[PDB]
Amino acid sequence: LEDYQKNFLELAIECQALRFGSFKLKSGRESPYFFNLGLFNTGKLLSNLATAYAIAIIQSDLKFDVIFGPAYKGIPLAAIVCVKLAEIGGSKFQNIQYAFNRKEAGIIVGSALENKRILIIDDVMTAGTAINEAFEIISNAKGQVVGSIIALDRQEVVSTDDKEGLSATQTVSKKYGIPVLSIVSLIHIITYLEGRITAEEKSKIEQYLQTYGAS
Amino acid sequence: IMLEDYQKNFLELAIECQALRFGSFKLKSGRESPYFFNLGLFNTGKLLSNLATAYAIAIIQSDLKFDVIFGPAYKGIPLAAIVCVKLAEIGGSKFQNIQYAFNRKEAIIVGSALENKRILIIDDVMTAGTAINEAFEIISNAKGQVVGSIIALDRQEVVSTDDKEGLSATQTVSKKYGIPVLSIVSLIHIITYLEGRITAEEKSKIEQYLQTYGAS
Numbered sequence: 207l208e209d210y211q212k213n214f215l216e217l218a219i220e221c222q223a224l225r226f227g228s229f230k231l232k233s234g235r236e237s238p239y240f241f242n243l244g245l246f247n248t249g250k251l252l253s254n255l256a257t258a259y260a261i262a263i264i265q266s267d268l269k270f271d272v273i274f275g276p277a278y279k280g281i282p283l284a285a286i287v288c289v290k291l292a293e294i295g296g297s298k299f300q301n302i303q304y305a306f307n308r309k310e311a312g313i314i315v316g317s318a319l320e321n322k323r324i325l326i327i328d329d330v331m332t333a334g335t336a337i338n339e340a341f342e343i344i345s346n347a348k349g350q351v352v353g354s355i356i357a358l359d360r361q362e363v364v365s366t367d368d369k370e371g372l373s374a375t376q377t378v379s380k381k382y383g384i385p386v387l388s389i390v391s392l393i394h395i396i397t398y399l400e401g402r403i404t405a406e407e408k409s410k411i412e413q414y415l416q417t418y419g420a421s
Numbered sequence: 422i423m424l425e426d427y428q429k430n431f432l433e434l435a436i437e438c439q440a441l442r443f444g445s446f447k448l449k450s451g452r453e454s455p456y457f458f459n460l461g462l463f464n465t466g467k468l469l470s471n472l473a474t475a476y477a478i479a480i481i482q483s484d485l486k487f488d489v490i491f492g493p494a495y496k497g498i499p500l501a502a503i504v505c506v507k508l509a510e511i512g513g514s515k516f517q518n519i520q521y522a523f524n525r526k527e528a529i530i531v532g533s534a535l536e537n538k539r540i541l542i543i544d545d546v547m548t549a550g551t552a553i554n555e556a557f558e559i560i561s562n563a564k565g566q567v568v569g570s571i572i573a574l575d576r577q578e579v580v581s582t583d584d585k586e587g588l589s590a591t592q593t594v595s596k597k598y599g600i601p602v603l604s605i606v607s608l609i610h611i612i613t614y615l616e617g618r619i620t621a622e623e624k625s626k627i628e629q630y631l632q633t634y635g636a637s
């Protein structure tokens with residue numbers, strides 16, 4: 207793990223973004239843990255979060271024109287990361303733009319996406335549903351998606367039906383031929399924060415991963 | 422009038438990025454304006470960084486004590502976020518734990534509960550004050566306590582031409598709620614700073630507009 211990933215994880219517990227318990231996910235799956243990025247809610251935490259995203263993006267060498275955040279929670283993410291890229295990235299990141307959608311229209315707020323290289327930013331990927339929806343919106347605007355970044359790759363399958371059992375992030379990359387970046391993955395949480403996870407929570411996570419974990 | 426270096430720099434960028442334009446614009450209040458300020462055109466990382474800093478300096482200057490910065494959906498949302506971040510970055514210990522919040526158009530608050538929290542409303546521009554009033558009601562529904570407002574531009578216009586006192590939208594809001602209304606710049610700043618860069622024709626159009634709508 208890199209230092210910024212360690213700090214991200216440390217702050218994730220501090221602000222309670224990483225919670226263990228019983229959670230019904232968007233996809234319907236009953237999960238033993240939940241990552242709530244919305245809990246990085248202070249000026250200090252948002253600054254650190256924007257920095258983590260920016261570092262991951264810069265180190266990827268991805269070339270793009272526009273960072274797009276899906277409504278609603280992706281909107282602040284796109285804005286703060288756009289800023290942070292200009293602050294820590296140097297000359298080629300000064301003119302990167304940000305955009306987002308309205309839920310109902312004139313759907314896109316920002317410069318026209320047509321023929322621009324777009325990086326999608328979001329919080330967490332589980333089954334990949336949220337990113338597919340963002341893809342649809344971008345394609346309607348005639349944007350060219352060149353990559354995606356999330357804070358947490360939960361490293362789960364799109365569906366248990368799929369025999370290959372590729373993760374949601376793996377399936378997006380393969381389908382589109384685009385990088386899918388993550389600040390951290392579930393494996394990083396398990397290994398680094400092993401002490402702060404109890405024996406029961408450890409087993410609950412492993413049992414969950416037996417059903418939903420990528421191969 | 423006084424112009425801070427950061428205000429001059431902000432205006433320079435506003436011209437550069439097309440945020441500030443002169444010409445015929447029908448405002449959302451129906452008023453036919455000789456100029457328009459489109460803050461959404463501060464749309465790059467560099468422009469947003471300067472914008473966040475400008476808002477932050479004005480907020481710091483004011484000594485306003487608050488818990489939450491609230492930006493109305495949709496265009497208020499990035500403003501709340503970037504300013505919450507900037508304040509923690511350049512404002513010191515006092516701003517480390519301030520939070521941001523915003524509304525959904527329909528289910529409604531995104532963020533920690535607003536109840537019993539001191540709220541700073543952030544928005545782009547005030548003309549007749551209609552948008553800020555709508556934000557007041559949202560925060561009211563949520564039982565938050567509004568302690569201040571900040572906008573990028575105070576257009577210095579009346580709420581209604583029928584009011585004989587002729588208080589501006591920002592003056593009206595301030596008197597009604599007993600709270601400060603801050604702005605990065607006002608129309609007077611734009612006119613004073615740009616001098617002859619606004620053409621004679623453009624100047625007279627502004628003067629004619631303010632003869633109809635300008636605050637006393």
Ligand SMILES: O=C(O)c1cc(=O)[nH]c(=O)n1[C@@H]1O[C@H](COP(=O)(O)O)[C@@H](O)[C@H]1O
Nearest residue numbers: 231232233240241330331332333334335336
């Ligand atoms: O429901 C989830 O899958 C989920 C798990 C989690 O740990 N954190 C989390 O925020 N979520 C929510 O579910 C989304 C990810 O699920 P997918 O759209 O299936 O990838 C995120 O965008 C969140 O809205």
Ligand SMILES: O=C(O)c1cc(=O)[nH]c(=O)n1[C@@H]1O[C@H](COP(=O)(O)O)[C@@H](O)[C@H]1O
Nearest residue numbers: 448449450457458546547548549550551552
């Ligand atoms: O329509 C306007 O009055 C207006 C003028 C301007 O220069 N810039 C600008 O953005 N506007 C839009 O009008 C709103 C302000 O109008 P009021 O709600 O009357 O105060 C802003 O929130 C913008 O949506």
Ligand SMILES: [Cl-]
Nearest residue numbers: 277278279280
């Ligand atoms: Cl959302």
Ligand SMILES: [Cl-]
Nearest residue numbers: 494495496497
């Ligand atoms: Cl809007």
